[PDB]
Structure 1
Amino acid sequence: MENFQKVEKIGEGTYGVVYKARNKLTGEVVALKKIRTEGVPSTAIREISLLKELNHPNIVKLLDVIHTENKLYLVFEFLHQDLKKFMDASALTGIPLPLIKSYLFQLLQGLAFCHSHRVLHRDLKPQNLLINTEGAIKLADFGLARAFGVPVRTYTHEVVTLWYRAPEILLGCKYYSTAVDIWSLGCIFAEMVTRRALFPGDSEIDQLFRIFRTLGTPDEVVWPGVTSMPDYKPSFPKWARQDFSKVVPPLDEDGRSLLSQMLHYDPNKRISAKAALAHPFFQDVTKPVPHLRL
């Protein structure tokens, strides 16, 4: 809009270009996201308006929803870097465990908040986890997936990553529960620790099979009702579960215990954000300052 001066392009978003901009009135710097045409369905407008109310220290603040000239612009709080870039920058040495714990702890607080309001993300990934120089990490784009379905490709034709997608989604479950977000966060937790994506699938079946080879092909024992899901196939190969000691070294026993609970197949058995915050893994949690060189 005319009220904002585009400083620069932050990157390509799921729904449209993302710009760093300055409000010509408050002088504040923000993140402007254009959402991609008939006239914007009232459903999306109402949903997004509700998002302006779910405010939390670990949720990127939605400053304004600008709907003008039949176009949508979301104005968000600006943060200088995302977890994906931070992880890439810390490849040689890896994010210190204390910071990993702090980040997971804060992220769970964010999920617990949104989940308590029955709002889920559905597309959590390192790219939408933002951090600042003070040791904070925040979840970006929360609640947008429900307002605008998550596409296979972005407006730039970029392939939306499947790496953090929960198995119930891959198996065709039409109704998502807050458990999908815990799954994603579990995958992210494992990636920060090992410095390598847990399940880097490059297709839905490849993603599903990578999960199967690590956690074992799910059956009626560990996941009641799984064999009756839309995309389940009795012909799926049968792989045996691997031991977490092999999956995420050198994560200690508390970490492995919590990760296992965040990666449970049955969405109903998967640990909640609230319960995870009480896990012994966070007994010695602190808030370290990450070293960022902007």
Structure 2
Amino acid sequence: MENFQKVEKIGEYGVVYKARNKLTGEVVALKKIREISLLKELNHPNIVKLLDVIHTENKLYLVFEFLHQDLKKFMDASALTGIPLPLIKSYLFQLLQGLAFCHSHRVLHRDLKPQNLLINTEGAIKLADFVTLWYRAPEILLGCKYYSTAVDIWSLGCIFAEMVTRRALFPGDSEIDQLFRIFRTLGTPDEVVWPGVTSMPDYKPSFPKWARQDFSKVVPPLDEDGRSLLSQMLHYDPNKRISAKAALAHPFFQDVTKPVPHLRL
């Protein structure tokens, strides 16, 4: 720990500081807390690099490359005009690349949210930090303990909708409020759309029965290609929900580019 000069707390199972490495001179993010040593080899341009793992005097320190901004603050700074569609598309495409990589190594994020998506001046966006319920998949809320990579696609679909509309898609303040906000928009799931749903641990026959709404009302002014991709990322059935690899081939990305964002640091 003495090899690092903490400069400021930057938030957060632990606490994260911006710090300087007294040996290399590098400015890093230092998180104070075999599976971790395994994550050190999971390297990709859209995953925040874990530089070092320091296991000294019981506690564990994780040293990551430092990124200057997060998506939540960027969306808050862009709320008057909105993030330009080409930049939304670039960020979505990059996060799907990051997830396709994670998912092929049987690694799940499980808690994607704007606060843990980090951005730089070069147009890159990165997955980090592998309670806010807004981005939680319905199978998690219904008590599935052995959920899949599809939970990350759901969270990314919710984030996609929020970048487009400048409002949270499902802003619940309790597990049942979160579940009922999803049901009110997408319709109360049944055996037709989601086989096996009625046998989920926390499913109740007594849940109210709401009808589905059209996506044209849910994400205006998203074009037909975007709405089609979003609908596939928000399928109730995790086995029907689009994979990160298949989403990368969706027509919505035919004209994808890598714009540079306006970042005031």
TM-score (norm 1): 0.89
The structure 1 segments of at least 4 consecutive aligned residues displaced by more than 4 Å after TM superposition are none
Shift of 1:17: 1.6
1:200-231: CA deviations, max 9, x gaps? Answer: 00000000000000000000000000000000
Shift of 1:88: 0.4
Partner of 2:187: 216
Shift of 1:8: 1.0
1:28-48: CA deviations, max 9, x gaps? Answer: 1110111xxxxxxxxxx9111
Shift of 1:176: 1.7
Shift of 1:4: 0.5
Q: Secondary structure of 2:112's match?
A: coil
1:150-178: CA deviations, max 9, x gaps? Answer: xxxxxxxxxx1000000000000010200
Moved more, 171-180 or 3-12: 3-12
1:179-213: CA deviations, max 9, x gaps? Answer: 00000000000000000000000000000000000
Partner of 1:106: 94
Q: Secondary structure of 1:87's match?
A: helix
> CA RMSD of the aligned region, Å?
0.9
Partners of 1:66 and 1:242 in 2: CA distance: 50
Partners of 2:14 and 2:149 in 1: CA distance: 25
Partners of 1:16 and 1:196 in 2: CA distance: 29
Partner of 1:146: none
Partners of 1:102 and 1:73 in 2: CA distance: 32
Q: Secondary structure of 1:231's match?
A: coil
1:244-287: CA deviations, max 9, x gaps? Answer: 00000000000000000000000000000000000000000000
Shift of 1:11: 1.8
Gaps of 5+ in 2: none
Partners of 2:239 and 2:165 in 1: CA distance: 27
Partner of 1:65: 53
Shift of 1:9: 1.1
Q: Secondary structure of 1:64's match?
A: strand
Partners of 2:11 and 2:200 in 1: CA distance: 37
Partner of 2:212: 241
Shift of 1:25: 1.1
Partners of 1:17 and 1:120 in 2: CA distance: 22
Partners of 1:212 and 1:170 in 2: CA distance: 12
Partners of 1:277 and 1:94 in 2: CA distance: 23
1:72-91: CA deviations, max 9, x gaps? Answer: 11111100010000000111
TM-score (norm 2): 0.99
Partners of 2:49 and 2:74 in 1: CA distance: 21
Partners of 1:293 and 1:137 in 2: CA distance: 16
Partners of 2:204 and 2:10 in 1: CA distance: 42
Q: Please state if 1:177 is matched with 2:165.
A: no
Shift of 1:16: 1.9
Partners of 1:287 and 1:20 in 2: CA distance: 28
Partners of 1:217 and 1:238 in 2: CA distance: 5
Question: Which residue, out of 6, 27, 44, partners 1:56?
Answer: 44
Partners of 2:73 and 2:147 in 1: CA distance: 29
Partner of 2:10: 10
Q: Secondary structure of 1:274's match?
A: helix
Partners of 1:293 and 1:174 in 2: CA distance: 42
Shift of 1:118: 0.3
